[PDB]
Design a protein around this ligand. Structure first.
Ligand SMILES: *[C@@H]1O[C@H](CO)[C@@H](O)[C@H](O)[C@H]1NC(C)=O
Lengths: 212, 196, 263
């Protein structure tokens, strides 16, 4: 509900801040609180009481407020600080909390790691089930901007492809996966099945082939 | 030279009645013609002397006690009177020898919305002895609970502000009062009138 | 210290959804319990909380379908909702809340907080009040105080979140298949194809394997069923020597199955 910006960006080691605009009955009271959502993890409690750091919080962060707008301030940006950030406070009752629209942080300047691709053919057991699923897995790349194509015997393939959207790893790089679902009468018929990955203009691919 | 009746009566400012000011008059010529003529006075009562027969009377020492009260309480500035002012602020003895002179000061001592700067003693543990001045802010014990110097419920600040707002009726408008006490001690007379 | 959520992973539309939450390291007379939710792609929505006293507060626009209950002999708080729809498919979090209402005693511009002696006060009893203008005194007229309310609220700790899918479909179990294989490394894997709904647990040798196990997010096959992969980086010479088995646990279907990644 609270009018946060959709997104924000800074640079490693630099300063950046988010704004949270509400009304007089919710933010004007003060006692605003900020939280950090690192995906795949339960959120952190960043700030509580306009500026007070929660137990175990690093001092890289600090809160601020002027009238009906709160500000979350950080400098010395880390890679582990890439996340969503949500402001919130009570409105007209201590037991009615409201959050903001959420703002996504982009920590610019990290190493543009090239992707690492692994490709698995359909397993023999899966073929015994008269199903085929080629598995293309992608690890260790940044930014989370990637495009995947499949080629049957060097020709492009459209049907049967489902692709994830990237996700964080432990080291704040990205990882994703792609699946090409085939009938075994198709897989047995071709000689090359190639997974090609486009990352920031670079191309990395792998290729499997049927055997007996 | 002349006695400073001007310095008192015509003073630009006065004291709160609980802390009434006393000026000592000695070695001068008390000429009252200014007062006989200054018909702006609302009250001019003399005790122990004829009010007209002043300029031919000598006294050893005179005391000019000046303060501010409200209209209804001017009556209390007299021997053998009772009330808040006469009992807790300014008491005159029964054998009083002197004059009580008072005049309205509404133009000077009344701020619109109330002048809350002149004080009077509301609570006191005993009545004042003649010519005594109590200036204590000792917390008064109004209730049965002892106060031990801490203000609270049934534990009150013993002084209170006059609500001197201009639009009041005359009886509640501020009055400036000067009480001249004459002492005819067994010593040389140092204050005489232009007569005698 | 920690919180632990529990409840259904699937619920049919229009049914009632019931979740519960337990505490560890603390119990239900020390903090207040709140319930938050997030439908991915949407922001966080407050649902309601129940405090140490035992009364409840809710989200006004959502209270029409809500209920919170409590039982502190089990260290349990229960959340529930009726007429569940698919907008509500979301992660539901059990939260440690800190909250308290607080007053402010303000006087109008032309007045101040004091005792009859004029000294500043800052209370609301023993003969102190808002007094007028230049005054010190006991009978000096008083006047109406102005009271402002501020509301504190913040979550000091979070649970791990409980994922709820709202769908008119069965809890189909997964078909789990092994994925056999310049640096000396090799790739093992387990493909966990069509199933429904999320989540899925993937351990390797019942947790013995840790460093190397890159488990991947699932996809949504156009069929409407999920499927994922879990890959392990191992040393190439340990193959055959070390039998590698993936333990896949899909609980909504009550099926845990293990597979060798055979050479
Ligand atoms: C006080 O001053 C006024 C004007 O200056 C004058 O009329 C009056 O005689 C004076 N009275 C005394 C007692 O000084």
């Amino acid at each position: 509900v609270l009018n946060q910006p959709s997104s924000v960006s800074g640079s490693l080691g630099q300063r950046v801040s988010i704004t949270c605009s509400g009304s007089s009955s919710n933010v004007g009271n003060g006692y605003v609180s900020w939280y950090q959502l690192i995906p795949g993890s339960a959120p952190r409690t960043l700030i509580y009481g306009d500026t007070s750091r929660a137990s175990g919080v690093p001092d890289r962060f600090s809160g601020s407020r002027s009238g009906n707008t709160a500000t979350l301030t950080i400098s010395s940006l880390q890679a582990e600080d890439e996340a969503d950030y949500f402001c919130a406070s009570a409105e007209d009752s201590s037991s009615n909390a409201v959050f903001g629209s959420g703002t996504t942080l982009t920590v610019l300047g990290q190493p543009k790691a090239a992707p690492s691709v692994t490709l698995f053919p359909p397993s023999s057991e899966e073929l015994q089930a008269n199903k085929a699923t080629l598995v293309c897995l992608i690890s260790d790349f940044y930014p989370g901007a990637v495009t995947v194509a499949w080629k049957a015997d060097s020709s492009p393939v459209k049907a049967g492809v489902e692709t994830t959207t990237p996700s964080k790893q432990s080291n704040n790089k990205y990882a994703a996966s792609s699946y090409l679902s085939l009938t075994p009468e198709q897989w047995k018929s071709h000689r090359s099945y190639s997974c090609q990955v486009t990352h920031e203009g670079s191309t990395v691919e792998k290729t499997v082939a049927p055997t007996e | 030279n002349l006695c400073p009746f001007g310095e008192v009566f015509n003073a630009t400012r006065f004291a709160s009645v609980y802390a009434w000011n006393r000026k000592r008059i000695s070695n001068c010529v008390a000429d009252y013609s200014v007062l006989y003529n200054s018909a702006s006075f609302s009250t001019f009562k003399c005790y122990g002397v004829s009010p007209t027969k002043l300029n031919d009377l000598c006294f050893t020492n005179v005391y000019a006690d000046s303060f501010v009260i409200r209209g209804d309480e001017v009556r209390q500035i007299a021997p053998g009177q009772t009330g808040k002012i006469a009992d807790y602020n300014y008491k005159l003895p029964d054998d009083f020898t002197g004059c009580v002179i008072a005049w309205n000061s509404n133009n000077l001592d009344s701020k619109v919305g109330g002048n809350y700067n002149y004080l009077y003693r509301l609570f006191r543990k005993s009545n004042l002895k003649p010519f005594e001045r109590d200036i204590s802010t000792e917390i008064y014990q109004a209730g049965s609970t002892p106060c031990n110097g801490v203000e609270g419920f049934n534990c009150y600040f013993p002084l209170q502000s006059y609500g001197f707002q201009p639009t009041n009726g005359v009886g509640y408008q501020p009055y400036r009062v000067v009480v001249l006490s004459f002492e005819l001690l067994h010593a040389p007379a140092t204050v005489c009138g232009p007569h005698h | 210290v920690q919180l632990r959520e529990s409840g259904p992973s699937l619920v049919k539309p229009s049914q009632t959804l019931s979740l519960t939450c337990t505490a560890s390291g603390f119990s239900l007379s020390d903090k207040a319990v709140g319930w938050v939710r997030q439908a991915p792609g949407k922001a966080l929505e407050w649902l309601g909380s129940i405090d140490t006293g035992g009364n409840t507060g809710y989200n006004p626009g959502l209270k029409s379908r809500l209920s919170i209950t409590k039982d502190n002999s089990k260290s349990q708080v229960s959340l529930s909702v009726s007429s569940v729809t698919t907008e509500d498919s979301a992660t539901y979090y059990c939260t440690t809340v800190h909250q308290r209402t607080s007053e402010k005693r303000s006087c109008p511009g032309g007045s101040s907080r004091r005792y009859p002696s004029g000294a500043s006060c800052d209370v609301s009893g023993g003969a102190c009040a808002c007094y007028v203008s230049n005054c010190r005194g006991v009978l000096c007229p008083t006047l109406n105080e102005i009271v402002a309310y501020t509301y504190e609220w913040h979550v000091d700790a979070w649970g791990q979140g409980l994922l709820v899918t709202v769908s008119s479909a069965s809890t189909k179990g997964p078909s789990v298949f092994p994925l056999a294989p310049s640096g000396g490394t090799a790739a093992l894997g387990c493909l966990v194809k069509d199933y429904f709904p999320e989540p899925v647990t993937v351990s390797w040798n019942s947790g013995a394997l840790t460093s190397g196990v890159h488990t991947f997010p699932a996809v949504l096959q156009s069929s409407g069923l999920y499927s994922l992969s879990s890959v392990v980086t191992v040393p190439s010479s340990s193959l055959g020597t070390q039998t590698y088995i993936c333990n896949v646990n899909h609980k909504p279907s009550n099926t845990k199955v293990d597979k060798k990644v055979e050479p």
